């Protein structure tokens, strides 16, 4: 019958068209940004701004990246965080200078501690068991100026250490890594935000490249 | 006057419970011992719909009961033809983060909300070319959990901002705003007469709203977790709500009570979809155990398992004539059960 | 690949 | 200022919701059985339908 | 001798267990990946390898009963033609698919950007057809030279015959020798040297790169890689070495019969190669945890 044949060929055209549109969407790296309390998400997007949720798509070294910021979503996270199950990596932003700052909503909650709770809820999240996290420590330029004036022991009492920029940054970097519980299956790549060009951009490409190797080897049976 | 208001709030809430307690004589399950169990409704997958390349979050059945729309996280909206297993239309989305979809009862328009705060309306015919965006509703500050078409011009959408809004397609303006939910609204269902609708939020509370007046007729609170699904009884005088604790509760509008609880010891995972049969006897609920369980609306006995989905069942719908039931899941497949 | 005898 | 106004709305809604009439559950639930039994034959899911009648074979 | 009798009986049971395990594993892999799993590039490669191995093992019992009764063929000419075409095509396709899987893994590891942006299913089948057409091209002489030959004693052998090609016995013998030597060289180079060099290089760079990146979190990846490469080498190098020695000494064998140990040793080498064809899904498909969870969910 002619009527069914026209419908049948239309479905084949739709089926064919879905192949290219699904191939151009599966060849782009999917990223996701978190961090509440002005952690530096807006600053982070600026470096890789080549081209409720914001899609800042960009391409670096002939590889396309898809970036999704969910900072405008003030609702419950558990009802939509499962939609991102399958992203290549998670770009988490933490402010180094936020150890002594306090949330605007509550005057008794530490900003750094709140970020740790958000980080803990992501590492232990059931939807990101095998999803790596690209940790970014923002505002390192202002952190070294503030760490000398304000001791870091106010945030973590159980820390003697030394009042130095390198010592304080390393301890914060280590503290986030030890907060992870799903070891041996995910890697928390960590970097410090730098005003120099193509510095943070290169780290994102380098971190994603390692994850792609992990994803490729996992699907190949080597992992 | 916080102390006085707290006492005033408590006494009314106690009055609601005290009035309900006097009104309650016996459970529906007790007075249904006599009715014949329906039996073992063994439903089979007559048609399998494939072609999506991501997790499927919502689906809707049209009045024709032949064309259904499915929303998937790949950024494509597909108008399926269940009779012949054909994709009538492929609607691309500006934002791939879609979690709800709707189909107009007359079949002229479709909607799809999500994390983008946009309820895009698409014209099915578009005689001038292919499917194109007709209107973009942008007045919500949260993810559009569920949207349903009321008429060809009026549509009601539930968002994550704990508010529900009724929209006009031509003007693109919120006709009225429904507020009162403490938690984020997750789903809504429309009565056959479209005069009333209920919304299930994350505060374990279900509220009945009036379309024309914007007033909340009733509030039901019988759950203890998120309410991810809701669906009116076919007569429109009752509805059933899903929950995250594997408990379906049937609420009657006239009774203003939780009639009965559809829970089992074996099932522990959450419920994301709730649907009713043509006669309302078979309460189909979509669970997270990778299968759909068909319940008895009067006997509290499971009457079959639709174990044909690889991933968690996220959407579930029943045709208006009840001819077939379509189940969608995160495994990027639709199973038509009949 | 498969070896074949010769008479 | 704002807290008392928002809280008063909940009390007004509670009083407003308490003014409706509660139909007795004994006969409200009885109507559910009547509708189910009336449309049981018409419902294709409750009673199996031969593949000839349905379009999904 | 007693040792020779055991050395002849053992290949029979080796091929029997190869048949059983290969059919079981290939059927399971096809049922899981081809129907209950999403269609991906690695899934397509695994499906092709499993299909080739299943087609080979389903053909194996003919070779088993041939080796049981002293290489005699009781079946017909068309059936032996089909059985040896299927055997040769399946062997060549399995080796070429192993090489292609190694190349794809090497490309994915060394250049992840190209793999992410230039690995599509359509291109996957387009480039997998290449090994198959190469197998057909290499098998063309096996298509059109092979035919069943009956000896005057009344026993039948399906081997190569050159009476039609050569008008006189001398030129027929000369063309037979030259074609057999050419086939041996092609087998050793394309069938063995090309993939063995590819497999060692492709897997060598994969291990080398992950070591430099500090990707070694467990011994499982190294164990799997070394097991695959070692098994492939120890099962294919002896058989191809025996074939090469037979081809380079074919003239002496057919003119003087100087060497006889090669003819005896062909059978164990063929058994080992067939056992590799059996175990390829085990070391290529069941290694992944996704396949295992899908399989256990399937039952």
Numbering used by the authors:
A (entry chain A): 6 to 56, 184 to 355
B (entry chain B): 3 to 340
C (entry chain L): 1 to 7
D (entry chain C): 6 to 62
E (entry chain R): 19 to 317
Task: Provide passages from the article that reported this PDB entry.
In the structures of formyl peptide–FPR–Gi complexes, the N-formyl group, together with the main chain of the residue fM1, forms a polar interaction network with three charged residues D1063.33, R2015.38, and R2055.42 in FPR1 and FPR2. In addition to the conserved binding site for the N-terminal formylated methionine at the bottom of the ligand-binding pocket, accommodation of the formyl peptides is mainly mediated by two hydrophobic patches in FPR2, which act as two “arms” to stabilize the extended conformation of the peptides. Residues L/Y2 and I4 in fM5 and fM9 form extensive interactions with ECL2 and helices II, III, and VII of FPR2, while the fM5 residues F3 and I5 and the fM9 residues F3 and I6 face to the opposite direction, making contacts with ECL3 and helices V, VI, and VII. Having a longer length, fM9 further extends toward the extracellular loops with its C-terminal residue L7 forming additional hydrophobic interactions with ECL2. The polar residue N5 forms a hydrogen bond with E89 in ECL1. Likely due to lack of interactions with the receptor, no clear densities were observed for the last two residues of fM9. The importance of this binding mode in mediating agonistic activity of the formyl peptides was reflected by a drastic reduction of agonist potency of fM9 and fHN at FPR2, as well as fMLF at FPR1 for the mutants D1063.33A, R2015.38A, and R2055.42A.
In response to the N-formyl peptides from microbes and mitochondria, FPRs play crucial roles in host defense and inflammation. Although FPR1 and FPR2 share 69% sequence identity, these two receptors display distinct ligand-binding preferences. In contrast, FPR2 is promiscuous in ligand binding with recognition to a vast array of ligands with diverse sizes, structures and functions, ranging from small molecules and lipids to peptides and proteins, which enable its involvement in chronic inflammatory diseases such as AD, systemic amyloidosis, and atherosclerosis. In this work, we determined the cryo-electron microscopy (cryo-EM) structures of FPR2 bound to Gi and four peptide agonists with diverse sequences and lengths, including Aβ42, fHN, and two formyl peptides, N-formyl–MLFII (fM5, derivative of bacteria-derived formyl peptide) and N-formyl–MYFINILTL (fM9, mitochondria-derived formyl peptide).
